[PDB]
Swiss-Prot record, chains A, D, E:
Subcellular location: Virion membrane; Host cell membrane
Coiled-coil segments on the chain, per record: 1-40
Protein name, per record: Transmembrane protein
Glycosylation site positions: 5
Membrane topology designation: Single-pass type I membrane protein
Part of the full-length chain shown: 693 to 732 of 983
Organism: Maedi visna virus (strain KV1772)
Length: 40, 34, 34, 40, 40, 34
């Protein structure tokens, strides 16, 4: 039981880390568009 | 940059699939332990 | 950008909280197995 | 058995998340080079 | 015992991945400030 | 930026080492459960 609980807790970390990484990717994309404008 | 974009989309698709499978397996283990 | 910043700070806060809870649960399981 | 299976499934997520994070780092590096050119 | 060990090993990966993601966020922020200067 | 680069390389090296050790430990647990 306690190891299953720990594994489930880690699963919540995996889901949240993925959501944060997606947000980070979004930030890079927002910034790349700004860089393309300055290059233009 | 277009290649970088195509590649990040592939990473995301595959990671989402792996996360879903892990979540399912975690549920099965939780149910077995209960 | 300000919105992106506010959002990354929220992600970080919540991820730090979840990491701490997972670490605690991992410790409990390790102690039980010993 | 089922908890070992779940742990292995999480291991695949960890390997894939790392590969995605590396790709994200690569993107930031590609963009920094472009920013350095515009600064020049 | 061995599954608890594996779970603890994964916990170290989760802690380190989070620290790396934070570093990546820092890099995007450093670069955004540089982009804002070029835009100005 | 050079410092940021040096630091991301250190994070990557250490994360790769931890991933390999976790994978090994996961294999051992899988074999024990079989």
């Amino acid at each position: 039981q306690s190891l299953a609980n720990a594994t489930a807790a880690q699963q919540e970390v995996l889901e949240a880390s993925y959501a944060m990484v997606q947000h980070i990717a979004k930030g890079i994309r927002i910034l790349e568009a700004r860089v393309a404008r300055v290059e233009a | 940059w277009q290649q970088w974009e195509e590649e990040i989309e592939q990473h995301e698709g595959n990671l989402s699939l792996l996360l879903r499978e892990a979540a399912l397996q975690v549920h099965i283990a939780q149910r077995d332990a209960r």
